[PDB]
Ligand binder design. Structure first.
Ligand code: NA
Ligand code: NA
Length: 327
DNA sequence: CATCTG
DNA sequence: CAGATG
């Protein structure tokens, strides 16, 4: 956790690089287990060989740990941190809609910066464009004080279109958090579930409302169960308009709401723990359901849930207020 | 994993 | 359709 942090960090640097710049998914994946394993390792890695001793740790990595332990740096690390090509790729990627793949293309075309991009807005697609237009706004954290203003709007509009909708804003926003990265809404309706054959309107209707009133400003991707947009809190009394925010709206069959809800509320660590304990209490959990575990190895069948409460109950545990859903 | 692009 | 992105 701090006893092999350098090593873990450098390995993650390297790992990322293979994957982002090179196309070395194998290599990439190589660094990853390595860091994962050195990461659990209970002692102070005093040398390559010592390390090598671990699984996932080969000769090449061992080599690398030595240089790093021998000197405060790594030439390779040094050489990559410079290289403009490599850097371009880490930067382009910052745009919403540009992945590594794309970053490689543009660089090879010479587009290496924000300006480059504007000059060539022809070469970017819709998502990528929006991304380019909201680069700043997009990187801006979201303060709870705005989060609440947003939540207030969405929920009110959803209510209007159908008294029967159920919306919930998950995320860390849900677990307390002072600020968040984006708005993530869970959506359901009684008239939509597991068997029930679709109802796309179920989601399209609300998206419309949201744009009707102007909260939603752009559509990144709109499907029949997941919407990827851009919202914005109405600029009050002209002098202070708000930054543009990322938002997601996703439909869920009512019969699988709470597990999702649970789930999305995280945090990752809380999940896991809960997950393992479910496992203990003779259960299974994942994103959509909780199933009683048979003994033959495994087994299925959806246990019926009416709230996050039903879940905990099931695994016989202390209902956890979202705030304490921390670890 | 769902959506988009081409 | 494969392949990219979030
Ligand atoms: Na990106
Ligand atoms: Na292939």
């Amino acid at each position: 956790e701090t006893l092999n942090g350098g090593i873990t960090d450098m390995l993650t640097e390297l790992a990322n690089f293979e994957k982002n710049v090179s196309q070395a998914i194998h290599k990439y994946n190589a660094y990853r287990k390595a860091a994962s394993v050195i990461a659990k390792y209970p002692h102070k890695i005093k040398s390559g060989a010592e390390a090598k001793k671990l699984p996932g740790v080969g000769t090449k990595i061992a080599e690398k740990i030595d240089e790093f332990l021998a000197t405060g740096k790594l030439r390779k690390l040094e050489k990559i941190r410079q290289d403009d090509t490599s850097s371009s790729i880490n930067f382009l990627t910052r745009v919403s809609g540009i992945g590594p793949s794309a970053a490689r293309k543009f660089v090879d075309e010479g587009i290496k910066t924000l300006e480059d991009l504007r000059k060539n807005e022809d070469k970017l697609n819709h998502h990528q464009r929006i991304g380019l237009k909201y680069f700043g706004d997009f990187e801006k954290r979201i303060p709870r004080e705005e989060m609440l203003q947003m939540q207030d709007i969405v929920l009110n509009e959803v209510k209007k279109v159908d008294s029967e909708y159920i919306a919930t804003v998950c995320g860390s926003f849900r677990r307390g958090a002072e600020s968040s990265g984006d708005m993530d809404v869970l959506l359901t309706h009684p008239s939509f579930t597991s068997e029930s054959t679709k109802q796309p309107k179920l989601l399209h209707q609300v998206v419309e409302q949201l744009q009707k009133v102007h909260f939603i400003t752009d559509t990144l991707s709109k499907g029949e169960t997941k919407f990827m947009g851009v919202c914005q809190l109405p600029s009050k009394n002209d002098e202070k308009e708000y930054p543009h925010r990322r938002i997601d709206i996703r439909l869920i069959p009512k019969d699988q709401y709470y597990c999702g809800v649970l789930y999305f509320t995280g945090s990752d660590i809380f999940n896991k723990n809960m997950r393992a304990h479910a496992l203990e209490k003779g259960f299974t959990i994942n994103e959509y359901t909780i199933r009683p575990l048979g003994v033959t190895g495994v087994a299925g069948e959806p246990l019926p849930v009416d709230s996050e409460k039903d879940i905990f109950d099931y695994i016989q545990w202390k209902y956890r207020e979202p705030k304490d859903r921390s670890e």
